[PDB]
Amino acid sequence: GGAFDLAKAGYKDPILVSGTDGVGTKLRVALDHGKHNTVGIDLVAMSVNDLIVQGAEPLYFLDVPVAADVITGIAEGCLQAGCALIDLAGFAVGVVERAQILPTPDIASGDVLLALSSSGPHSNGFSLIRKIVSLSNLSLHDTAPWDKNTSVGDALLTPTKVYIKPLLPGIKSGLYKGMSHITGGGFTENIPRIFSSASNLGVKLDLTSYSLPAIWKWLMRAGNVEAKEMVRTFNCGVGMIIIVAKDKADAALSSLKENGEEAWVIGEVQEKKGVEYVGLDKFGL
Amino acid sequence: GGAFDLAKAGYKDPILVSGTDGVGTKLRVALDHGKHNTVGIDLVAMSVNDLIVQGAEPLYFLDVPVAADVITGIAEGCLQAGCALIDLAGFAVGVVERAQILPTPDIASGDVLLALSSSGPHSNGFSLIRKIVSLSNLSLHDTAPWDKNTSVGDALLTPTKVYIKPLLPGIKSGLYKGMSHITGGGFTENIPRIFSSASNLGVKLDLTSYSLPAIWKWLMRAGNVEAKEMVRTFNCGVGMIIIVAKDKADAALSSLKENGEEAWVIGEVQEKKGVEYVGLDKFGL
């Protein structure tokens, strides 16, 4: 009831970390569509995903009948993340063992980047998406031209994935060296945050390592969005980027899939600041 | 920057506790008066004072140009409590050693109640106070008839005291067995919360052990408020009630005064559920 026994939770050297994030335009999409339960899940997912990149298990979370529908989603999001419930914004508190806190300072050139699939746009890029959908003469309750089994609104309102459960096992085992929750600004803006402001290291991202999900292929064509713009606006099907040493890449991938997260090798660390893209001319085929 | 090293903070067996409280009508008083910096301090004081009763040091706190003035008060309140900043409502997170968490289960009949003076009404009872002031033909910017050196508004807007600093030393030394932050409902509603719902123990409060502060003597007369009503509505000059064993009463009092809190013996624990008052006919003289 508000108090958490950290030792009973398994922590003998706990470090407290705090995360915060918001939703934004996706709420306007939930309004115009009528269903708001997902945006409550998004507010939790975004907040707790910002904790897991540091290796922390979430503990607390804090943030009209519209408000009633969202609060039910927040509840569903906490149950999926495993934390206690206390333009939108959320705040979560988590804990991580001192020896397991991320990112580590052992990151070097040659380390491998892994990618976790996203459920969709998550909670970023909806201002542009709405424009592309409208100019294509579509409405939220139309059948999605890329997924005939669902409507445009439902596909866009798909809740942000919660990456707490599938990552904690590898965090406890020291399989990961750093992570980046892919939110606004795509790969270009998010991945560099793993390194220091004056770090000589960056990443090389192989955009041919996977096939673009259908929703992004459609948005890319319907909106005449060039590949270099896609990777700077949307998550492009990747919800989380994780850096791991080469000798641990197999174990990390096995752990992620064991916990139900589709993962693959998407790039590598190199001695060049920023994000460098391979196959920009093939991205989207 | 959002992360707290609990071991570095001195905790080898930390327990996390969460506190929450609001201000309420005192904000309307700040509006009608023009100065809102104090209500920001109140929102912090109330939240952190609900943590200290459990023995916990506050760590995090979270909650128009009116909003600008209050945020400055919240800042001033966090600096006084020592926590990091993240009808109003606040939420604070604190930490306490397992062996120091309060209340203890060793409370028994014969233990002594100590009282800490309040700065004024703190954050409760302003609906009735406003009525009494108005019917007395006074306004917020009139000179307080009980304190000629200040105005009615300033005296009523006095910020709630922060009891973190003067209590932590005694919490670490195990001098206290339990506390009750006196908020709404006066002694009658707050003190019983220290015990279990089915506890056979209560308290005997000696209302002749101290002189009522001038503001309460005035409100008691101006508003024709009977003593049994005072102790069920206002804090009556006592911001915190603390239970201590008889053999530790001297040490506790010495510790509280050493840290600048005027404290005195106000009652004792006895085998009778509820709050029992002594000297109700003398209260206010």
Side-chain angles (χ1 to χ4, degrees):
Chain A
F4 295 158
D5 188 333
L6 289 178
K8 189 179 181 180
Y11 296 84
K12 69 169 186 58
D13 197 4
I15 303 291
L16 297 181
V17 293
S18 54
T20 175
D21 208 329
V23 171
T25 300
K26 188 173 192 173
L27 182 62
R28 297 176 177 267
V29 182
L31 257 60
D32 294 335
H33 192 65
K35 196 67 179 178
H36 316 84
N37 75 275
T38 63
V39 295
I41 301 172
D42 292 306
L43 199 70
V44 175
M46 300 288 292
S47 295
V48 302
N49 284 345
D50 291 324
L51 290 177
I52 199 68
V53 302
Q54 310 177 244
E57 175 176 8
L59 296 172
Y60 303 111
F61 173 85
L62 180 58
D63 50 314
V64 273
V66 157
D69 191 4
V70 173
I71 291 168
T72 65
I74 290 169
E76 297 176 351
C78 291
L79 303 181
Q80 189 167 11
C83 55
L85 180 57
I86 301 306
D87 183 67
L88 304 183
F91 170 81
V93 177
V95 59
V96 61
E97 281 284 19
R98 184 191 304 277
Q100 304 174 11
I101 195 170
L102 305 174
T104 76
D106 290 356
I107 306 179
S109 179
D111 288 338
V112 183
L113 275 70
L114 283 57
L116 298 185
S117 67
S118 62
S119 62
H122 286 182
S123 308
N124 292 89
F126 281 97
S127 290
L128 179 58
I129 290 168
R130 296 295 300 276
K131 293 280 186 59
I132 298 169
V133 172
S134 296
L135 272 62
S136 303
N137 303 129
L138 289 178
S139 62
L140 295 175
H141 285 78
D142 291 7
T143 303
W146 63 86
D147 184 3
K148 300 164 66 181
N149 298 279
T150 186
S151 65
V152 176
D154 294 330
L156 297 177
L157 291 174
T158 301
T160 299
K161 299 189 70 165
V162 182
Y163 294 115
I164 303 303
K165 290 176 179 176
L167 277 51
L168 281 180
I171 293 162
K172 299 174 183 182
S173 305
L175 299 177
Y176 312 134
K177 306 176 80 66
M179 318 186 189
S180 174
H181 184 219
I182 306 305
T183 60
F187 301 119
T188 296
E189 199 163 39
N190 286 280
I191 295 177
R193 306 302 308 279
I194 301 176
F195 305 95
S196 303
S197 57
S199 188
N200 303 322
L201 293 183
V203 302
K204 182 199 304 307
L205 207 67
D206 182 7
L207 296 173
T208 66
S209 58
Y210 70 114
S211 183
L212 249 188
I215 183 174
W216 301 117
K217 285 187 177 171
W218 188 93
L219 287 167
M220 191 176 186
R221 290 149 172 74
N224 188 31
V225 185
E226 54 195 349
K228 61 172 178 177
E229 186 178 351
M230 294 283 294
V231 302
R232 290 172 168 77
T233 307
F234 306 115
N235 66 66
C236 297
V238 175
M240 183 78 71
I241 289 285
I242 303 163
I243 296 179
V244 311
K246 256 195 183 188
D247 53 74
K248 288 184 180 287
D250 285 0
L253 288 176
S254 298
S255 176
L256 294 163
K257 285 178 174 168
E258 277 173 9
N259 292 276
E261 289 296 352
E262 282 292 354
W264 69 96
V265 177
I266 191 169
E268 72 183 319
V269 182
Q270 65 179 12
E271 303 181 317
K272 176 167 180 178
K273 193 186 195 66
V275 182
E276 178 159 277
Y277 296 100
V278 181
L280 276 169
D281 55 335
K282 306 291 188 181
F283 187 65
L285 307 183
Chain B
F4 295 158
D5 188 333
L6 289 178
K8 189 179 181 180
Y11 296 84
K12 69 169 186 58
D13 197 4
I15 303 291
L16 297 181
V17 293
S18 54
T20 175
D21 208 329
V23 171
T25 300
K26 188 173 192 173
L27 182 62
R28 297 176 177 267
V29 182
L31 257 60
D32 294 335
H33 192 65
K35 196 67 179 178
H36 316 84
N37 75 275
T38 63
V39 295
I41 301 172
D42 292 306
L43 199 70
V44 175
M46 300 288 292
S47 295
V48 302
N49 284 345
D50 291 324
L51 290 177
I52 199 68
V53 302
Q54 310 177 244
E57 175 176 8
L59 296 172
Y60 303 111
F61 173 85
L62 180 58
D63 50 314
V64 273
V66 157
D69 191 4
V70 173
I71 291 168
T72 65
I74 290 169
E76 297 176 351
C78 291
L79 303 181
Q80 189 167 11
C83 55
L85 180 57
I86 301 306
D87 183 67
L88 304 183
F91 170 81
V93 177
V95 59
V96 61
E97 281 284 19
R98 184 191 304 277
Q100 304 174 11
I101 195 170
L102 305 174
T104 76
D106 290 356
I107 306 179
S109 179
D111 288 338
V112 183
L113 275 70
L114 283 57
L116 298 185
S117 67
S118 62
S119 62
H122 286 182
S123 308
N124 292 89
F126 281 97
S127 290
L128 179 58
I129 290 168
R130 296 295 300 276
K131 293 280 186 59
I132 298 169
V133 172
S134 296
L135 272 62
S136 303
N137 303 129
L138 289 178
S139 62
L140 295 175
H141 285 78
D142 291 7
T143 303
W146 63 86
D147 184 3
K148 300 164 66 181
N149 298 279
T150 186
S151 65
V152 176
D154 294 330
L156 297 177
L157 291 174
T158 301
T160 299
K161 299 189 70 165
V162 182
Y163 294 115
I164 303 303
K165 290 176 179 176
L167 277 51
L168 281 180
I171 293 162
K172 299 174 183 182
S173 305
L175 299 177
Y176 312 134
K177 306 176 80 66
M179 318 186 189
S180 174
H181 184 219
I182 306 305
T183 60
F187 301 119
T188 296
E189 199 163 39
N190 286 280
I191 295 177
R193 306 302 308 279
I194 301 176
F195 305 95
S196 303
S197 57
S199 188
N200 303 322
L201 293 183
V203 302
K204 182 199 304 307
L205 207 67
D206 182 7
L207 296 173
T208 66
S209 58
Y210 70 114
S211 183
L212 249 188
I215 183 174
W216 301 117
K217 285 187 177 171
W218 188 93
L219 287 167
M220 191 176 186
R221 290 149 172 74
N224 188 31
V225 185
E226 54 195 349
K228 61 172 178 177
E229 186 178 351
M230 294 283 294
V231 302
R232 290 172 168 77
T233 307
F234 306 115
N235 66 66
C236 297
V238 175
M240 183 78 71
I241 289 285
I242 303 163
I243 296 179
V244 311
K246 256 195 183 188
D247 53 74
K248 288 184 180 287
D250 285 0
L253 288 176
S254 298
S255 176
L256 294 163
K257 285 178 174 168
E258 277 173 9
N259 292 276
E261 289 296 352
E262 282 292 354
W264 69 96
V265 177
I266 191 169
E268 72 183 319
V269 182
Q270 65 179 12
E271 303 181 317
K272 176 167 180 178
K273 193 186 195 66
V275 182
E276 178 159 277
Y277 296 100
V278 181
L280 276 169
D281 55 335
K282 306 291 188 181
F283 187 65
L285 307 183

